[PDB]
From a paper:
The glycyl unit at the C-terminus does not participate in interactions with nearby residues and remains freely exposed within the binding cavity. Although human ABCB6 in vivo would not encounter PC2, which is primarily found in plant and certain fungal cells, the high conservation of the mode of complex formation and the residues involved in binding GSH and PC2 suggests that ABCB6/HMT-1/Atm1-like transporters share a common evolutionary origin and mechanism for heavy metal binding and export across diverse organisms. The CASTp program calculated that the cavity volumes of the Cd(II)-bound structures in complex with GSH and PC2 to be approximately 2312 Å3 and 2573 Å3, respectively. The smallest tilt difference of 3.9° is observed between the apo and Cd(II):GSH (or PC2)-bound states, with a clockwise rotation of one NBD with respect to the other NBD.
ATP-binding cassette transporter B6 (ABCB6), a protein essential for heme biosynthesis in mitochondria, also functions as a heavy metal efflux pump. In the present study, we determined cryo-electron microscopy (cryo-EM) structures of human ABCB6 in complex with a Cd(II) ion, which is coordinated by two molecules of either GSH or PC2, at resolutions of 3.2 and 3.1 Å, respectively.
Author numbering:
A (entry chain B), B (entry chain A): 241 to 826
C (entry chain C), D (entry chain D): 101 to 105
The structure:
Amino acid sequence: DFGRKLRLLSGYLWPRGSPALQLVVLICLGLMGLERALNVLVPIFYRNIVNLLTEKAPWNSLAWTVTSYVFLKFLQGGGTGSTGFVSNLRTFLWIRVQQFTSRRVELLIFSHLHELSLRWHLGRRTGEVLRIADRGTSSVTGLLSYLVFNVIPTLADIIIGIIYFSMFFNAWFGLIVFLCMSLYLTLTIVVTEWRTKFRRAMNTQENATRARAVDSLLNFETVKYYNAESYEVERYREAIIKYQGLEWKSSASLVLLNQTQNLVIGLGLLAGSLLCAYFVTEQKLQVGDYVLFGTYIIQLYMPLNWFGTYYRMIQTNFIDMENMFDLLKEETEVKDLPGAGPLRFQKGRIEFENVHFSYADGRETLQDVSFTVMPGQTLALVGPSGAGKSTILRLLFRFYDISSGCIRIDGQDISQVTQASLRSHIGVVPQDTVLFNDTIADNIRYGRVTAGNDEVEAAAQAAGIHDAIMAFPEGYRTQVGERGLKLSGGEKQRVAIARTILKAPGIILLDEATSALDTSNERAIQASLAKVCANRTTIVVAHRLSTVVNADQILVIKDGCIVERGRHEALLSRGGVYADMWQLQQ
Amino acid sequence: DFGRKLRLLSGYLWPRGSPALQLVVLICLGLMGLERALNVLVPIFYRNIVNLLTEKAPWNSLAWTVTSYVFLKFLQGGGTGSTGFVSNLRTFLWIRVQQFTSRRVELLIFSHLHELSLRWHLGRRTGEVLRIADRGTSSVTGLLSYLVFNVIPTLADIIIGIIYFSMFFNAWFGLIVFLCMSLYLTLTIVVTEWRTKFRRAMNTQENATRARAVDSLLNFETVKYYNAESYEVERYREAIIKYQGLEWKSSASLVLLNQTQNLVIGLGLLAGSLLCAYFVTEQKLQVGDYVLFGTYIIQLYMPLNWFGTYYRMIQTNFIDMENMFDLLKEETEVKDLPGAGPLRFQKGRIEFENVHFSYADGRETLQDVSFTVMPGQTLALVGPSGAGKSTILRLLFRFYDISSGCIRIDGQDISQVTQASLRSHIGVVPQDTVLFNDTIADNIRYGRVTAGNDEVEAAAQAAGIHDAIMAFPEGYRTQVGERGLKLSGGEKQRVAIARTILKAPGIILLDEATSALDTSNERAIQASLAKVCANRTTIVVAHRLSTVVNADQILVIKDGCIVERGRHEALLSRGGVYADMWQLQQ
Amino acid sequence: XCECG
Amino acid sequence: XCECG
Ligand SMILES: [Cd+2]
């Protein structure tokens, strides 16, 4: 698992497109190498300074060596390595590089999320699916940073120090450093797993307590069904105590981890210092070697202080990146595109042949359904409240797929046509239109982006909404939606009419809204529909009399099956739609 | 401002109630003092070790001094001071202390939020008001910790080092350390303000980008009104680029701050080291004084690496704590309790005298309204859809206050009575009842907590819901609400009936629900209401004929004013409620 | 080490 | 000295 995940990380490391960023990557790697070299060099110069000082050297050489050592200590981090001029140049350049990868990953995720089929988006919520994506991009960035620039450099420092001590200092100090660092790493990992178990146990109860508090605040019914303020306080207190117990366990585990790491490094330092002092007394080592060993041990210790955290974060980011990859691979485009060739929209003839469709498991909704609309002619659909009418509207728009049957537009099966042209050629008015947070002019032009402002104004005039736009103070810069002011029913229905005018479609998949409003504005809206649906193939879905009376072919659906066919007056005489119209609306 | 805020923090420091925690506080302060002492002591022992080593001392004294120095370096932090045995004992004991303060503050806030009047809760949302409280408790805890244990210790270390160098080392090193630290602090603050401006500028755009992504994901209408996937992708990319430019500016400012701090410490180290080396060559100082100065300068530097962060966090937590205090002081209990004395509920006679009430600004809803209900008699309220009926129901329950007039229960004005007994004696059935996430048995006993399980089962039987509880698999342990399964209308109406049976009230402020359901279950529910409202004063609010026909005194409200008074048949003959009943429901 | 988690 | 904040 480690090998494959490292392979994916390495694949994401190199910027594929720009050449100006690979140079920056190489410079950053070179700076990392230079930091390792400085890590080795500085204690050596400290030893040289002490050795020169102990033998009464003249002022000139001492001054120049002191200046050089101070300069090296400035280049290296004055503390914890995250401080020097080097590695800060590195943070700068890696800012510039990591920005590119973050943008690319975010755009790839956002461009994949917009092509999955509808059933996928009706299934899962939006908050969870966006949390996974955000956490995935943060995971890839943090994994690259953490590993490459904080974990491998330290494991290289340990090995380099082992080599230097074992070859250029003595033989036993190699054993000392090796044993100390091995024990440190082993104990850190072993304690860290245990502490992770405790941390998860605490986090669950924290979330539960927050939920309880939110629930007690939202329902101000505590006053009604009792004087139960005290009870809601007491349950909150009990939950708080439970959470506090778990938190105490977790943080005591943290303190234990810190103490064991400190004890290991202290034992190593004690052994090394005692051996070095004994050797110095026996004229085998010089006075500077003592401070060399002390400084180098502290220098090794400082990065090691943050390895439990790195272990935790590496594991978490690995599982997160696996989640993000497994939704990137989820190629559920079930209503995909086999073949190509744009639909030839001559006039707008729609056909049906005993189509079979079933999206709800077990039961089947649409069976043996076939009808036809002449170009320009208007068809209506009436029946009991359910899904069949909206379902067939969705089927015509190529959202789901037909299990068995045939469905054509102008003698052309839409199963073999590209989705883009199909969806471009067909207009529609939904149940309730939604205006995203932007200006009114932008919402109008959203029907066709390339169009200019004059078309926007002309269509707003054509839809009878332009005066109400002038009623707003700012006008065409007015903030709309949740951020801006709220809109009444006629306003949003008219803006939908405006944008569907902009789109200039051939078929209007009208779906009349059931929103309650004054009859005058309602009849104005229906008139606007009448002059926008003129000379265009139309399919109307409504529970009202207005669509029924003037339509050309009324259809009735019972459990997703055609029971009555024909015209308004024949259905009236049959004793069918007559009873439904008299009972439903009266 | 600083003095006042420090006074409040100091007031919160000392645990007022338990004695076992003040001992822990004193021990923690003593440990802080011991850490300062070790901070002074360790470099002195390092100098002693070097001095003994350079003069060829025998092995015994060297061994014991080395062991003592290693022990002191173990007690003191092996790195960055957050590592030693001391201050880790302190973190342990302060865990135990800080849990107490966190609990007390959280419970104070939660007990104050449940006593504010209704208008306050209808005004503000719940997420914002809970965010302020959570951030306030975190702010007080973090302020105490940050200041007391991380800011004053460092400013004490700087002064102690200045004194030690200026008195026991030489005169010029005092100047060196003083100038270095003064420049460090000044530059840190000056750069930090600039950087926080940049940080806020970046955070706003980050939030905007997240909102844009959320909006584009929620509205899967992009496919509908265009093939506008590309347009949404491009807008997302532009927003990303804007956020990225702001992020680059902020983090470059961070790098500049790091570099200026490092340069200041490097200049100080260079000056000190050069002067110390020159003095050593001139036989004025010993060899160990050099390593003393170097170690002590590094030791001073290490805590100082995190002062921009502490400045930012101190400012943000101060403003957050002020927000929390200013909502703790918001004593807006406008429907307060002047006087005391529980209401004497003899039988349940309700009176009214031309009450004047107006909660909506400008217009007034209730004016010149007066009626009376005999004990046991049922009164109904009918009229156009609005607020007057629910408004008067709220007024009877002492939610708002009467601007002018009189309202009595059993010849006793409720303005002079305590709210607890009033709300205890009056039951209520709301528009839609809500079941918080818990078991069914708990939701039933929520009407009266002290009651046992047998009463719960008896009332569930009396309300005709007990069999449906047995239908659930777990039964009385079934999870209900958002966490658990969903419930139908009759189920929640019956659980409301059950809990109001448990409460055993005298007046039933019935408010019939408008939820659509089958007529059989509806009439069963109405029958249950009839046998639960028997022998109890009742006020019924509904749009249905069932309450109207059998009531004892029908009242009609027009713009919050009584227009028709009397019985069902008189109102029928008047030509009033007759037209309304025939038009509204038919 | 932070608590970062 | 993240970043926190
Ligand atoms: Cd942190």
